[PDB]
Amino acid sequence: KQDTIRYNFHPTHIDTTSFPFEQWRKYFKQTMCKENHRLLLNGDHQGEASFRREIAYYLHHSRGVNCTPEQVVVGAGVETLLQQLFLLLGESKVYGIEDPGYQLMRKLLSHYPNDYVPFQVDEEGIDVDSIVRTAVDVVYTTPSRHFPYGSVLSINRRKQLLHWAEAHENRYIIEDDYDSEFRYTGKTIPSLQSMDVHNKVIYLGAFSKSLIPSVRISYMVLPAPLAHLYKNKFSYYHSTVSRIDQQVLTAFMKQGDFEKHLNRMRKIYRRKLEKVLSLLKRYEDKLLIIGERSGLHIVLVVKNGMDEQTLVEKALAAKAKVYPLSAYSLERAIHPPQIVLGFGSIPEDELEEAIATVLNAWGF
Amino acid sequence: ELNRDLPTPLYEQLYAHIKTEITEGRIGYGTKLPSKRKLADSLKLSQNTVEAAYEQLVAEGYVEVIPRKGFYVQAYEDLEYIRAPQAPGDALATKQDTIRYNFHPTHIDTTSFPFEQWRKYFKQTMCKENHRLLLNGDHQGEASFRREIAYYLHHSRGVNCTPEQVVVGAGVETLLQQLFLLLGESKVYGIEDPGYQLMRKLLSHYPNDYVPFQVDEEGIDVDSIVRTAVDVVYTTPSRHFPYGSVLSINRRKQLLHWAEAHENRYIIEDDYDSEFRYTGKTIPSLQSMDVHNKVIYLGAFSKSLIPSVRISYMVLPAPLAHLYKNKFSYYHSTVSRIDQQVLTAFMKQGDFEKHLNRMRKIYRRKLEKVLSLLKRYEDKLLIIGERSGLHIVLVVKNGMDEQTLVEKALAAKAKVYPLSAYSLERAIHPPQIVLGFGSIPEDELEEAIATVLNAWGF
DNA sequence: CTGACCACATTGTAAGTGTCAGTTTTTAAGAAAATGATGAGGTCAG
DNA sequence: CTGACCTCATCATTTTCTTAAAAACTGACACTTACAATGTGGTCAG
């Protein structure tokens, strides 16, 4: 991504002034001491055993995942967590991507021999019959929340996809959490793995939109057949999460000091959501709003007569960074140029003027 | 039906009792779900309790709303199948648990690292006005970090490279796969054998091919590579694992000309261990001689500074770096921005040089002490390449094969490292055993050597 | 009897301990604000 | 014409939240000492 002049909007951003520096510093200055000389040398390759038992307990008590600790595996970034899966499965597969989606599996297949099968996505979710008619083997879905429109899978389509997977032994399912645990009224839904008693789906979650983008931890769980294969085939690599950054989070989330950050962050964001919605409700004549209320971003559609190209350059001409939707979807978009905006990285006390200047830039 | 006074509120109970009626089939599809006002009186609860018992189910999709009519069920009979697949695994791992006396050649001394300077440097970085450092910036490392590395190597190792080329990454393996994908799958790679078990095993996945070679006291079979059709080669110039062999300079002109002969050839130079020669500084870096952009530099901060910070660097020549930037504009780095902005100051104020000096002197002292205790028994034990390195190679001339010797180390709770693992060909009739000491401090060398030597009956 | 060889003594820093003065963690208390549950209402079609 | 979906408050309770005091910390200094390089001074070999 890019640096900003004045203000920018980005879904992957976050508002960071609210993060407790000091409750991190205390754990750090506890963790690496003179008595602790063994941590300097290289540890295990899947993360330290405590950092996995604790993730097991956390996910069981927050998302319904019933995973015995030794399955889960750590990784760094997100994409570097994926490759090891690609070469693990093989190169005789074709992966199912939502055509509007998070443009990741597109760029991680441009460098491997496989190719991808696009799909259309409706206001309820992804298709479930288009996969059935085609012979795709792996699909990359967002059961908890659909980037960037916000649709949520019902029970019917989820049960159809799971029964589809159970049809034969040659296909696998990717779950991508994105921005869950931020669902306000409830906790969204018992996560998709919970419904499975067939050990046929993998879990993929992150620590980089809820805690910190730049500390670079992620984690997946593997079912009984795939975890053993991965371990037995990949013992000779080395873990990529620093062993000093495992014990800090083991304390930071072992004594109950992560939930007290999540609960605070929910509010931190809800008020901003309501303030921006209140500011926009005056402007309902033209700048329509699409999307169920959750997460960190909204998609505004502009029914003015201006085009996406001159719109974006006019926005950036007066030191305002706008983010057009042309890139996120493979096909050409509709006549009203959809625009995705995120509010996370903007300062709270400047929404009221930043949004106003943005709306001023194009037309009053 | 009593769910008051529970720590569990009434929302996720009534919303949980509708689940039974819809999923278990007591309420059919399309049936009229009673509206709230009839229900609110029915259960004695107010509307705002049962309201959110339902307003959740619209998102989960168990029911659907009609704007002026009651909520209606839209949830088919679920296809519940009960079959529990389970698969066992071999789960290979070659490392033993917490037991005394580890002699692994990778370990670096742990107790002597300046914890306190580390913490002091850390405290000044992650602070209140230092936000903008929890989100991601540039993907190719801190700009200050690149400039600092470029100035460090240019005056400490003879490297001539500008920062714009330099690359930072995570370890070595993840620093190598971005190179395999960068070059292609039509190449064949030249390795050393016996040697380091990384590039041989790491290519058990990719289509590419590898050519085993052999190592003399001069170095690698440069003429053999000349009389072959390999394209990009892996060598360890300034020191050679694990014999301490050093590449002769004339062979270095030969290898430079070998690479220069054909345009598509490139040379991997991996000087993992540097500035750790006990005497006379160390040989200058190979790429200082090359003038026409045919060599890439690979090195890391992971035996010098700390084993577990997982950081490395890598230099690219201008045509290859340009192409790497064009084709990799979307990846993001794997080194925490905080670690980068900490180490930039940590080496901006010169403390790393002091650490180098202290550990260098510590390790020399350990090696002369070990040699002076090692030297008295020489009827059966001999050493190669003593002058430099963090490890020794110990040949055992007892009249019996090496497997029992290796296992007897773990019989008495000692960790030993036979060279058979690093060696493809088995031409070792007198066993070669390599020993490391770097993790064990000075005061324990005596007892460790005594017990391990007694283990073999000495 | 001189250039060579062999020969210790001066020297300029890293390594150890005490003071102090400054920001600096740890702990108990009073106070604020949000949550779930009750209750009184709100508008609007067919 | 019932019936339907829906906007305000004040509650009991608790899990966040700003405050003031006393104890642990760590910085620039005082030096003082060890460590190990270099210049030096003794005789040696035709």
Side-chain angles (χ1 to χ4, degrees), chain B residues 107-110 276 278 358-368 389-390 437-440:
Chain B
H107 294 349
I108 320 296
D109 214 23
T110 63
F276 269 50
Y278 293 175
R358 180 153 40 83
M359 311 275 318
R360 176 189 306 186
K361 297 172 184 178
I362 289 164
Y363 275 132
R364 76 165 60 250
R365 167 163 67 252
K366 292 181 181 179
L367 194 47
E368 288 89 5
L390 277 58
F437 40 77
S439 66
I440 314 299

Side-chain angles (χ1 to χ4, degrees), chain B residues 259-271:
Chain B
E260 212 285 339
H262 212 262
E263 176 271 351
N264 61 355
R265 301 164 162 166
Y266 287 130
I267 313 307
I268 282 181
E269 65 183 1
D270 179 0
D271 52 349

Side-chain angles (χ1 to χ4, degrees), chain B residues 244-307:
Chain B
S245 308
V246 176
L247 205 79
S248 61
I249 188 167
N250 53 6
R251 278 180 184 200
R252 289 182 174 192
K253 277 75 70 177
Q254 272 175 230
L255 204 53
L256 180 64
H257 283 84
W258 176 101
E260 212 285 339
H262 212 262
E263 176 271 351
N264 61 355
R265 301 164 162 166
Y266 287 130
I267 313 307
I268 282 181
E269 65 183 1
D270 179 0
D271 52 349
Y272 75 99
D273 190 359
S274 296
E275 295 293 328
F276 269 50
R277 183 179 176 183
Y278 293 175
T279 197
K281 314 202 91 203
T282 301
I283 190 166
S285 315
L286 174 50
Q287 65 182 357
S288 65
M289 292 155 218
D290 164 71
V291 188
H292 280 98
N293 308 115
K294 306 296 293 177
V295 54
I296 57 174
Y297 185 120
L298 189 151
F301 292 167
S302 180
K303 274 196 210 91
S304 307
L305 158 64
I306 305 195

Side-chain angles (χ1 to χ4, degrees), chain A residues 194-359:
Chain A
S194 65
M195 311 185 238
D196 176 26
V197 306
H198 287 319
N199 294 41
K200 205 62 151 73
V201 66
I202 68 171
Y203 203 112
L204 190 145
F207 267 86
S208 66
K209 217 109 49 155
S210 78
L211 174 144
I212 297 169
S214 194
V215 176
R216 283 331 184 170
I217 301 95
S218 308
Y219 59 110
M220 92 182 58
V221 179
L222 296 185
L226 191 64
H228 302 186
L229 159 68
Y230 178 81
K231 184 179 284 290
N232 199 35
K233 190 67 172 68
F234 264 69
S235 70
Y236 273 19
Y237 292 59
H238 64 265
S239 181
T240 314
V241 55
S242 181
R243 188 175 176 180
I244 76 171
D245 263 333
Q246 301 197 17
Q247 293 298 329
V248 291
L249 274 155
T250 300
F252 194 90
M253 211 165 47
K254 170 61 188 62
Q255 300 164 354
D257 210 351
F258 203 50
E259 302 78 5
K260 312 195 196 328
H261 182 220
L262 271 178
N263 288 359
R264 171 185 151 160
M265 294 299 291
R266 287 192 189 184
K267 306 177 181 180
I268 300 294
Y269 275 131
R270 204 212 302 280
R271 177 209 318 111
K272 303 188 179 192
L273 191 64
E274 309 297 344
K275 287 146 70 162
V276 67
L277 265 65
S278 296
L279 198 150
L280 61 83
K281 187 160 287 299
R282 192 267 185 192
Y283 274 101
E284 190 81 352
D285 53 323
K286 308 288 188 65
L287 283 71
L288 194 143
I289 297 89
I290 189 167
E292 191 205 90
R293 39 174 61 196
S294 179
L296 283 72
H297 47 105
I298 62 170
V299 192
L300 61 84
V301 286
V302 173
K303 65 178 72 66
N304 190 31
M306 157 185 309
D307 46 309
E308 195 176 11
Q309 174 59 256
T310 308
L311 187 153
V312 167
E313 66 89 18
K314 268 302 168 281
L316 272 296
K319 290 73 161 153
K321 192 173 188 59
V322 75
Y323 276 43
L325 195 47
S326 180
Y328 282 85
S329 182
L330 188 152
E331 303 163 351
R332 174 32 41 81
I334 56 178
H335 284 157
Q338 300 176 358
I339 283 179
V340 170
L341 290 196
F343 49 84
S345 65
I346 209 63
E348 161 175 349
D349 62 13
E350 274 305 272
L351 285 169
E352 314 278 30
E353 183 57 29
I355 298 290
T357 304
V358 166
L359 301 194

Side-chain angles (χ1 to χ4, degrees), chain B residues 255-405:
Chain B
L255 204 53
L256 180 64
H257 283 84
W258 176 101
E260 212 285 339
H262 212 262
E263 176 271 351
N264 61 355
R265 301 164 162 166
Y266 287 130
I267 313 307
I268 282 181
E269 65 183 1
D270 179 0
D271 52 349
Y272 75 99
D273 190 359
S274 296
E275 295 293 328
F276 269 50
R277 183 179 176 183
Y278 293 175
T279 197
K281 314 202 91 203
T282 301
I283 190 166
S285 315
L286 174 50
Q287 65 182 357
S288 65
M289 292 155 218
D290 164 71
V291 188
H292 280 98
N293 308 115
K294 306 296 293 177
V295 54
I296 57 174
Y297 185 120
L298 189 151
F301 292 167
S302 180
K303 274 196 210 91
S304 307
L305 158 64
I306 305 195
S308 289
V309 73
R310 304 331 310 250
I311 304 185
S312 307
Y313 55 100
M314 182 283 258
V315 184
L316 285 179
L320 200 63
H322 164 91
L323 188 153
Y324 178 86
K325 154 201 290 193
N326 292 116
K327 175 222 291 173
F328 273 121
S329 70
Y330 76 87
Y331 263 75
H332 50 79
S333 61
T334 309
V335 178
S336 308
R337 220 183 199 268
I338 299 313
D339 280 350
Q340 286 173 45
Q341 275 289 354
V342 161
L343 279 186
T344 178
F346 181 99
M347 181 85 267
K348 187 45 193 172
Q349 303 179 6
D351 185 285
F352 198 52
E353 307 166 357
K354 319 308 160 270
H355 186 209
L356 278 181
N357 303 355
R358 180 153 40 83
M359 311 275 318
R360 176 189 306 186
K361 297 172 184 178
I362 289 164
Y363 275 132
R364 76 165 60 250
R365 167 163 67 252
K366 292 181 181 179
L367 194 47
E368 288 89 5
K369 292 189 169 185
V370 166
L371 288 178
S372 296
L373 61 80
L374 179 74
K375 182 180 302 300
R376 62 183 183 241
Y377 296 0
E378 195 157 339
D379 52 342
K380 303 189 61 82
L381 283 72
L382 180 61
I383 62 171
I384 313 165
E386 67 184 339
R387 73 279 193 190
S388 303
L390 277 58
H391 72 87
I392 62 170
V393 61
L394 188 153
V395 299
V396 183
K397 293 184 288 295
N398 56 2
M400 212 275 288
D401 63 358
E402 61 88 19
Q403 279 296 289
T404 301
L405 282 71

Side-chain angles (χ1 to χ4, degrees), chain B residues 140-176:
Chain B
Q140 56 189 357
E142 289 281 320
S144 176
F145 193 95
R146 293 179 293 173
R147 304 277 335 277
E148 199 278 332
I149 284 293
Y151 194 81
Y152 152 78
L153 281 170
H154 186 271
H155 290 335
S156 182
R157 277 302 308 235
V159 175
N160 296 321
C161 66
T162 60
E164 189 173 1
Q165 285 83 342
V166 187
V167 175
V168 297
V172 64
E173 318 179 286
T174 303
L175 192 50
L176 268 187

Side-chain angles (χ1 to χ4, degrees), chain A residues 1 21 25 32 40-42 79 83 107 155 159 166 197-198 213-214 216 228 232-233 235 237-238 242, chain B residues 79-81 83 85 87-89 92 119 126-127 134 136 139 173 205 307-308 310 330-332 337:
Chain A
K1 57 183 178 182
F21 306 96
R25 289 177 167 191
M32 153 200 71
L40 276 298
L41 60 84
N42 290 318
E79 61 263 20
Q83 301 180 180
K107 303 301 188 56
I155 186 167
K159 208 70 191 290
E166 212 270 332
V197 306
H198 287 319
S214 194
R216 283 331 184 170
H228 302 186
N232 199 35
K233 190 67 172 68
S235 70
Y237 292 59
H238 64 265
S242 181
Chain B
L79 309 187
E80 298 279 350
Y81 277 20
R83 282 132 63 177
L92 187 143
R119 300 165 161 175
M126 183 177 177
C127 183
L134 290 182
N136 286 133
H139 307 120
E173 318 179 286
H205 304 143
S308 289
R310 304 331 310 250
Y330 76 87
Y331 263 75
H332 50 79
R337 220 183 199 268

